[model samples]
Target chain A: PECFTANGADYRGTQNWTALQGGKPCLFWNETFQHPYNTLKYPNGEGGLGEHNYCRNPDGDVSPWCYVAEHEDGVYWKYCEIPACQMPGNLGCYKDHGNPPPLTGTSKTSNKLTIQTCISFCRSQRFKFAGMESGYACFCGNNPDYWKYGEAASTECNSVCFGDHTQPCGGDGRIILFDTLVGACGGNYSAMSSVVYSPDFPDTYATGRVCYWTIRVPGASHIHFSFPLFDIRDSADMVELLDGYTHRVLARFHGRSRPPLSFNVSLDFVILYFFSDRINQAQGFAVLYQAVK
Target chain B: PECFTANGADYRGTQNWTALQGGKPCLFWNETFQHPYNTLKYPNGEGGLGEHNYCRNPDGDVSPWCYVAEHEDGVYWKYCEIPACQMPGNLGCYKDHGNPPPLTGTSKTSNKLTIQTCISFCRSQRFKFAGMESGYACFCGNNPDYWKYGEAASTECNSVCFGDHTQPCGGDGRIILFDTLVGACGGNYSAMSSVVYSPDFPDTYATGRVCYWTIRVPGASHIHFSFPLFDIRDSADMVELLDGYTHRVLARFHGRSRPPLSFNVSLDFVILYFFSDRINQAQGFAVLYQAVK
Candidate 1:
């Protein structure tokens, strides 16, 4: 029941449906061929369509299309099914340290290393970022400076994972990164007292970033905020606090000084905004916010 | 036997020696003068001779000589005997948060407040510094910025402890400080592993300061240094690491960013210098050093 030819273009046997005709009903393997391209692109290891380019886009959207290539025995179809999307606030991976791995915590050479397994390994170590490179290598670190190497094409990370062939591990010299979303990234906390810090708590934060956090306590009249540590480039960058009602700037803090142990606001909602410029980053800060009478 | 003023400076009255001669030896009552002052300097809570001076200096050093005043009924003298100088690394009392106390920790108002009791209270709370102000008010914090208020005259802290009259607490807006010396500010260590921190780690360190610490683990081939936290003004101030054998600079780190987690040295001794200028101050850093084979 395979359609041999359609609209002057061949579509049959191992070469499924290859092209489509306007207003004409085309059939493929006894099924309708709605969209088809005559020219098929082969994924080479180089720029255009490389090994890194899987079946999905950067936003985790799956394309209902694939490519066909003629083999010696038959034709092979290539496509990717999008796995479960990463959680919110999950920063995808980029190139990591090459000469000497920046993240030196744990190393496990598993032929069974899937993205999930590597992420679990790094997460067990309480690392913020987990990276898989060179096919079988997993690295973990609290702070990953992707700006140092930048991100390679998605196709560059096309090495089939030893455990899960559908998913690709990173290629040589390239690391596929995934954020663990632990240690002060983003979460909803409801308590009388709690601690909050920039992304990596006691570690250096990302550059050219704007982060917002909201703290709310039910039925509380006032919120108190205090910093155990505070460091930033004075005047250039700052942590701004806004009043929840008027949305006006309540306070702007920078420099290497610590503010008073506590600040009081009349509302239950406390909004915090941390902004950093292009140059010079500090270790950031940790604050303790408590609901008081 | 008492020596009377022989220079016609009131030698006839009950008033004892008033003036001093370069080579003259003066004698006083064999019995200790309980609370003496040559000229009655009542601590009227003013800047002059009251609330700003103590019998002994902050360093716990006792003055070798004291003045005695002869009243109509008896002679009185004010003096203090140095207690077994507070352990090895104790840098003595400093005037802390004046007027409205700066440190925010456990507060206790006791009629029996002594330096020892206050220190014990602060120590139990795990605070590195204990301060007593207004004679009976005790406050605890890690870093007390003595530079802000400056040290008062030794005689300023003249209030006898309500708990132990033998020791002086503090007076008026003055606070007598005591250091707990928990971790490392400066000291010698021969253990295989050790930890070091700026004056008041996790808190604002003093401004306009230079401090050095030498680490030596004898018989060890190499020393490893790692920082859990680091924040300082770049270039202008820095923590310098020097090779013990060659006296060469191994590394100089400053700015808001943290150094690598670990540094290795071939020698057993490693010297660290932390310097800060007059303007900005940071929460500082904490480093761990371990001797490796």
Candidate 2:
């Protein structure tokens, strides 16, 4: 049996767990105040309305609560309570049907695997994507593409963690991947000569993305740029150069081209903008640049 | 005689100067490339028929030559050549009709005013918009509107800069504004308490804008937030709070209201999103937050 206090009144069950603060009725134990009573349709006065149906601590006393709702009495209400452990990612599993492995670059695997342990390893290695496989193996890479192996059913990755059997790791070849969501790939280059390329270069780049690279050289009268390889989905994608000062596109390019042997800018700084749409991706690009007095 | 050489051939006139190096044409002596022959309407077997344009150093014994064209006739052609100043934000003071003072905040007057100087000052102050007015004064703000004083004719900002007489600043009461084009506003906050508001808070905010603020306090179990003053065009505008991990909207509000006396989040991190439409403007919002153990 559980009891909670709301606005100086003792209430039993989650149904009467409404309290008033700031002159408005709201639910408790959750950091964010939620008022289900504020509306009529879902008017039972509770949180976790629809498919996002979940409850928080009812009395600011114990573990958070999760609930499912129903319509009755001309109003909707939270009638059934569920254990928080059943929630996605709550029992140590990927929230979504995990992503694939890196399209390019090396991937590492290990036998000692828990979701957190795999994620920590990938993060420490600076890899952008991490996955668990065979209930024990951890694989890491930066690319999101999983090659010929697309996403399998969530149940396929149902093997328990080798280290913590209570938590599902993943099954053989069916990876449970997560994006490290690392910062964009870029930096300020002041070297006399250097190369700039798309992230996880040599691999098909990510979709729906924009990246910027700023190049500068000290005391250089001009900067010369040339591309070694350029392959972008024509018309739909582009690489633009802006005069470092005015921030105006000096040039735009895509598709195969008779690579200009070189192009030079008078200013010491050069800004590059690379943008790609959601569909059709391709091998990206690489450019070599050098400073000239 | 101002004579120049291109491809080992001597040439005269600003039109015929061409130069080459390493099997490619480039330019020297001039900051930008120009070639009038790269055209089809002008109908020369030159540039624009394919890709880039072609040009020789209009003046040389200087650098080489550069071509703006694709490889077809075994040589690149000059498809087109236009004044470099024609680029946006290059030849003009302000691309859009300039705006006036304090739509956002802080206006400064100076006898020595150049667009660059004003831009630098505003950029240093972390302002997104910088303007020059009355041929000498510099005004800085982020909100891009100046209600009572609407846009003036382009000719209104005809006064020349006090520092650089060649460039027009602004006329009396008129302003020539430039977007410092700074990246979005954001940073990691570790302080126990602080205030966050739209750029130029307490003043009219800019039109058509989106800004974000991310707040975090080390070791805090949660955070408490409060907005004492909130004014935005009622229904169409809003300020949103999102769960940092799930990126789910926790709440949204606009217009006058008994601002929740307090809002709390059970995390060290909180993300705020502020958005405003194009028309009706108003004094934005200011929020105060503190860490709770």
lDDT of 1 by residue, A167-214 (tens): 556778777676553334444556776666664432345554455567
> Lowest summed-lDDT stretch of 10 residues in model 1 chain A?
A3-12
**Chain A TM-score for each candidate, in the given order?**
0.40, 0.40
lDDT of each: 0.51, 0.50
What DockQ number belongs to candidate 2?
0.01
lDDT of 2 by residue, B59-145 (tens): 211122345333344554331121221112212234233343443567676777766577667877888677777777877777745
* TM-score of every prediction relative to native: 0.23, 0.24
lDDT of 2: 0.50
* Residue-level lDDT tens digits of model 2 in A201-223: 32355564456678877798999
Could you give the CAPRI-style class of model 1?
A: incorrect
Question: A-chain TM-score in candidate 1?
Answer: 0.40
- Angstrom error at residue A161, model 1: 50
Off by over 4 Å in 2: A1-293, B1-121, B124-187, B256-258
